[PDB]
Amino acid sequence: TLPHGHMQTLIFLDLEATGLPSSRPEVTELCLLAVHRRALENTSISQGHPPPVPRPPRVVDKLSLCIAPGKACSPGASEITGLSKAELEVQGRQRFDDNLAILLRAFLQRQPQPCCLVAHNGDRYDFPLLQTELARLSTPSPLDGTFCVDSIAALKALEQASSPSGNGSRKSYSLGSIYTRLYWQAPTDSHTAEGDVLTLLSICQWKPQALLQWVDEHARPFSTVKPMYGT
DNA sequence: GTTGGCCCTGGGCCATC
Ligand SMILES: [Mg+2]
Ligand SMILES: [Mg+2]
């Protein structure tokens, strides 16, 4: 049974940032793609080998923002994301501030509840980092009433259900690895927030109903997510 | 990941930017 009822909204989420967790990173870009449960329930499965990449539902809400970090990106981070602190400031990007939190709140309020965030390795990166970024602000966390799941665990379950191999053979569950296994194509616009969100949506549309059920079964409160680091 | 949070039977696995 379900610990928090049926999720009515799935918000696929990705961030770009200044580096990996040990660097105490800051968000440089974020993308939200909100899809209603019904749009997933009515997603048509293809049984092709490989199946074609599914198209996103007609009805979606999308938000994509570039964000000026308080610290510089690592050379690696810059090279893969195509972003830098200097260039973001040049183009007048504002920081992760109260106005952004208010922006996120209004966007989230337009989505039916309960709502569940979906992010690849979200449990170990995206969710803790958002918790940290939002905790810095006086604006109450816009995500405090929302739930969240990690799509890695989701896809491990779904792929292992599909017949072998592996059959106990280990494989990568990186975003790109999954996408390529499922669709035999390289993902496009890699390590851009919107690009990776669309990639995430695609692998989540591989088995729409099975994913929805898994999400409903494993959704936990975002309020329970430990911040990546502290002030 | 160059880390570090997991799972395992002092180490191996492996993903986010
Ligand atoms: Mg990501
Ligand atoms: Mg990304």
Numbering used by the authors: 5 to 235
The authors write:
Three prime repair exonuclease 1 (TREX1) is a member of the DEDDh family of exonucleases and accounts for most of the 3′–5′ exonuclease activity in mammalian cells. Anchored in the plasma membrane of the endoplasmic reticulum (ER) through the C-terminal domain, TREX1 degrades a variety of substrates to prevent initiation of autoimmunity. TREX1 is, in fact, unique in the DEDDh family for the activity of dsDNA degradation, which enables its participation in preventing autoimmune responses and in restricting retrotransposons. In this work, we solved 4 X-ray structures of TREX1 with representative DNA substrates to delineate the molecular details of the multifaceted catalytic properties of TREX1.
To uncover the molecular origin of such precise removal of the 3′-overhang, we determined the structures of TREX1 complexed with the substrates that we devised to mimic the intermediates in UV-induced DNA repair. The structures of TREX1-L-structural dsDNA and TREX1-Y-structural dsDNA were solved at 1.7 Å and 2.0 Å resolution, respectively. The protein residues interacting with the DNA substrates in these two structures are shown in S5 Fig. The active sites in both structures also adopted the active form of conformation. Both structures contain regions of short 3′-overhang (1-nt- or 2-nt-long) to illustrate how the 3′-overhang was removed. The binding mode of Leu24-Pro25-Ser26 capping the nonscissile 5′-end was also observed in the TREX1-Y-structural dsDNA structure. In this case, the crystal also contained 2 TREX1 molecules in the asymmetry unit, and both bound with a Y-structural DNA of 2-nt-long 3′- and 5′-overhang. The scissile strand of the Y-structural DNA was trapped by TREX1 via more than 10 amino acids, and the last nucleotide of the 3′-end was inserted into the active site and stacked by Leu24 and Ile84 in the narrow active site pocket, as observed in the structures of TREX1-dI-T-dsDNA and TREX1-L-structural dsDNA. The last base (G1) at the 5′-overhang of the substrate sits in the gap between TREX1 and the last base at the duplex region of Y-structural DNA and was flanked by the Leu24-Pro25-Ser26 cluster of TREX1 and the T3 base on the nonscissile strand. With the nonpairing T2 base of the nonscissile strand flipped out, this binding mode is similar to that of molecule A bound with 1-nt-L-DNA in the TREX1-L-structural dsDNA structure. Therefore, both structures that contain duplex DNAs with a short 3′-overhang revealed the binding mode of Leu24-Pro25-Ser26 cluster in TREX1 capping the nonscissile 5′-end. Nuclease activity assays showed that the exonuclease activity of TREX1 in the crystallization conditions of TREX1-dI-ssDNA, TREX1-dI-T-dsDNA, and TREX1-Y-structural dsDNA was inhibited, and the nucleic acid substrate in these structures was thus intact.
